Structure formats: C-alpha cells, structure tokens
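Appendix C: a fully annotated inverse folding record. The material below is reproduced so that readers can follow the format used throughout the book. The structure is listed first as tokens, followed by the designed sequence.
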C-alpha cells in the first residue's frame, strides 16, 4: 500500500496501590522503550553496528534480527529503558529508531509485602496478588488515536484522538505497612531462631474485618523476579491448607457453652489420656491427667476431654459454629489461588469423626480462615467479612457466638496464655492476651499459634504458622508463642491500644 490509517493504543497510567495510610506499595513509573521499524532500518545499514553496540547486541545477530523481522514495521529493542537512556541512542539519529514513555510498576516496599501486593506481567497486566484481584479497577482504559502511516507504516500525521486514556483508580489496602514490616521482620527472625523452612503471619482488625498484615516466608523481590522459584512465590497464608488441630478447640468449647449442658467449672475425667473408638484410639499430647475442668482441657489441650464433651453435645453444634466463623468456607476476597479448605458435613456424624472434628483433625483451613475465625471470637462472637482493602464503612457482620459465650471463651484463653511461663510464653507485656497453640502433621509438622489481644476488650487477632521448626520440644505449638508475643506487643503499641494489665 501507498498509505494506511492505523490505530495506536494510548496506554492508561495504572492506579497507585497504597497501604491504609497512603504509603505507596505499587507505583506506575515512566519507562522509555526504544523500538524500531525494521522496514525503515533496511535503508540505513551502515548505522546498524553503532546501533547494535549501543544496545550491547551482537553486530551479526542484530543484523540477522533486522533481516528476518524485515517485512514488519515494529520490533522492541530495549523495553526496559529509563526516561533518559533512549536519548543517548536517539542522539545517534538512526532512521527507523524511536523512544516512547510507557509505564512499569515499581514496588517500594519490595519483599516486605510481595505476596499481598503481587505484581504485573511485562504487558503491565495484573499477574498475582492485589494486582490481579483488582486488575480492572487499577488498569483504567487504554486510549486510541488514528495515525496516517507512509508505505513503511511510519507516522506522517496524527489524524485525531478517537478516545482519551482513562487512568486506573488508586487503591488503599487494609495493610498497615508499619505492622507489615514488624510482622515480616519478626517472622523472618523466628524461622532463623527455630531453624524453620517456611511460615505465615496474619494480623486482623477484629472490629473491621481488615487484614492489617499478611507476611509469608520465604518471599521475593517483585522488582527483580529473574531467578524466582515457586516456593518463594507461594502466598502460603491463603493457599497452604492444613488441619488446625488444637487451635479449633475454642470453637468446640463455644458449642459446649451454648448447649446448656456445660460450664467452665464442669469436670471431665480424661484418664488415662487415651480413649478407644472402635479401631481408632484418641491420644492426648500429655497423659498425666484424670479430672480436668473445661479451662484445664484447653490448658492441657486434652483431645480426650474435648472428644467427651463433643459426644455429649453432638458434632452438629460444633460443625455449625466452625461453619459460621468461616472455617472451610469462601472468604469472598477472590484472591488468585486462594483455597477454601474442607469442613466435612455428615447427615449422621459417626463417633470417630465427632471426636476428630472437635480437636481439629476432621477439617482443613488456611491461616487466613483461622485468623478470621479468631477475629469472630475476639469481636464478642460477631463475624465481620474479610477485607484486603481499607474499610471506611464497616459492614454489619453476623452474631455467630453469643457475646456471653464469647466473653467466657476469651477468659479461658487468657488463662491458657497465663499458664505458660518461661521463654516459650505468649504473654504480651502490659496486656492480657488470649490464644491457643497447636501442631498440624504434614517426622514434620506446622507449629500454630492463634490468639487475640487485649483479652478483656479485643482489637487484634493473629495467626502464626512456622513450617517444620527444628526446636524439638514436646509441645511444637509453643515455638510460635514468642512470635505472637512480640508482634502482638508491637501491633497494639502502633495502634495506640490502651494497656489492660496495669496494677
């Protein structure tokens, strides 16, 4: 053809991702892509080696790429390039060679919030994390303009803009970058201290449903993804599913206290620390007990004690609490690769399954779902939907556990924390804290700690997961208690929460 009118897309600026206080997490930054019109280059062959060398490219390979891509009017040369870096190559005045400003994401907090924020592909489209989940919101709408191209498809005239570009929208996450740094730093130190391979830490605001922090290890620099492995890319808090084990006993206990049949001072005989159910044997972590009250069943974490309570109240009451606080359920966050786990139902709950459910072997959950469940218990038994975006108007939420029962369980979990002395305590200085440790079998396990503070008027729920630690104590869950202590202490101070353990 002697001429053609073509479309050129006008790229939109992608919206700013910030933390809840407007700290930048994902910023569209100007980049200059040197591009070439092969069809024009074929007229200036004596310039090629100076160009090649200016692109660090091999003179013969470059001359080859230009001969092969010859009946083409566009090739990329250096799609990275900064504002200026093209100007030095453009100063060469080679015919068929061009610079443009595009946009490319920069992630100022880097590895600290890699999994939450995610990243864009080389086409500036969401690939992982928030970047993918909110791609439409952030992307905006490419503009378009009509150009008249000569017989090489090079622009002679701009005819009209047919559509102006619409910038993408700013997005404020729920994430508090100050708490995220604290969590990231303290999880990394715990994994080193404890010789562990991986882990997760989730912080939630129990009143708003907001995810204040979500850190996984290992992590990755989203600015430099060259030699990344699947291990480091794994958003474990949302995709690793596990049996919550001892950490769900508080839900079983909530069902017991709602039933009309149990009070905290009631006694169960758990001797001799086993209970046979046909061919299955329930076995306690410690087997030195006879009578325990309901608080003691959580302090000792007796599987037999919670199983005997379950047989009495029926699995259906326990299933119903676990379902209502979201265990094995869709969070609605629509994060890419987010797992829902599994909360088995039955018409007729068999005896083995009644017990296993009650001590957290019947089901599978994510660290996010476990944090959300603890939020409901901390929030006087009211569940508030999860958010990874800043919550200005708090949704209604659902009363799933009576405030009275929630208050009683909170007080039992404070006693669980007060029972542990020494270096593996979850005790939070200046505050009353509440929580339950646990292990999940994968020999190897995940160390779990779930809790909330302040215990008498809760603000923050936290789940710690430490994947195969090497600190081989009898109680593997306690490896996660000091991390909870340090990160809870820091989070309450950063959020100016008044101490509830004064003299």
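Designed amino acids, in order:
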């Amino acid at each position: 053809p002697a001429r053609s009118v073509r479309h050129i897309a006008i790229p939109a600026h992608r919206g700013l991702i910030t933390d809840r206080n407007g700290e930048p997490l994902a910023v569209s930054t100007p980049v200059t892509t040197l591009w070439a019109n092969p069809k024009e280059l074929m007229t200036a062959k004596e310039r090629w080696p100076q160009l090649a060398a200016a692109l660090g490219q091999d003179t013969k390979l470059f001359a080859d790429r230009i001969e092969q891509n010859a009946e083409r009017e566009f090739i990329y040369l250096v799609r990275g390039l900064t504002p200026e870096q093209g100007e030095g190559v453009i100063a060469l005045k080679v015919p068929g060679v061009y610079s443009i400003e595009e946009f490319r994401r920069f992630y100022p907090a880097g590895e600290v919030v890699a999994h939450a924020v995610g990243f864009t592909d080389v086409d500036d489209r969401g690939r992982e994390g928030i970047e993918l989940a909110f791609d439409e919101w952030l992307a905006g709408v490419p503009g378009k303009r009509q150009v008249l191209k000569d017989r090489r498809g090079r622009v002679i005239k701009d005819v009209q803009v047919t559509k102006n570009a619409k910038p993408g929208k700013t997005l404020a996450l729920s994430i508090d970058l100050r708490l995220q740094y604290l969590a990231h730093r303290e999880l990394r130190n715990a994994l080193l201290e404890n010789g562990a391979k991986a882990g997760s830490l989730v912080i939630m605001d129990v009143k708003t449903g907001e995810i204040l922090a979500m850190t996984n290890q290992p992590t990755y620099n989203p600015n430099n993804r060259r030699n990344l492995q699947p291990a480091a890319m794994r958003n474990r808090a949302m995709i690793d599913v596990f049996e919550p084990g001892s950490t769900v006993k508080p839900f079983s206990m909530s069902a017991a206290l709602a039933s009309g049949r149990w009070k905290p001072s009631d006694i169960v005989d758990v001797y001799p620390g086993t209970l046979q159910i046909g061919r299955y044997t329930i076995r306690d972590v410690s087997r030195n007990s006879r009578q325990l009250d309901l608080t003691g069943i959580l302090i000792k974490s007796s599987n037999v004690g919670i199983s005997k309570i379950a047989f009495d109240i029926g699995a259906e009451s326990i299933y119903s609490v676990m379902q209502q606080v979201g265990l094995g359920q869709d969070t609605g966050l629509g994060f890419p690769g987010e797992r829902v786990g599994n909360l088995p139902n039955h018409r007729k709950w068999p005896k083995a399954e009644t017990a296993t459910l009650a001590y957290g072997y019947g089901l599978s959950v994510t660290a996010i779902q476990l944090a959300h469940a603890y939020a409901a218990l901390a929030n006087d038994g009211k569940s508030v939907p999860l958010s990874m975006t800043r919550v200005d108007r708090v949704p209604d939420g659902v009363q799933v556990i009576s405030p009275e029962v929630a208050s009683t369980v909170q007080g039992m979990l404070q006693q669980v924390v007060e029972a542990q002395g020494g270096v593996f305590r979850a005790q939070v200085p200046g505050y009353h804290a509440a929580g339950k440790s646990g292990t999940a079998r994968k020999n190897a396990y995940r160390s779990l700690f779930a809790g909330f503070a302040p215990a008498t008027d809760p603000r923050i729920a936290m789940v710690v997961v430490i994947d195969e630690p090497s600190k081989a104590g009898y109680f593997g869950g306690l490896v996660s208690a000091p991390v909870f202590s340090k990160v809870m202490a820091g989070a309450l101070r950063l959020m100016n929460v008044p101490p509830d353990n004064l003299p």
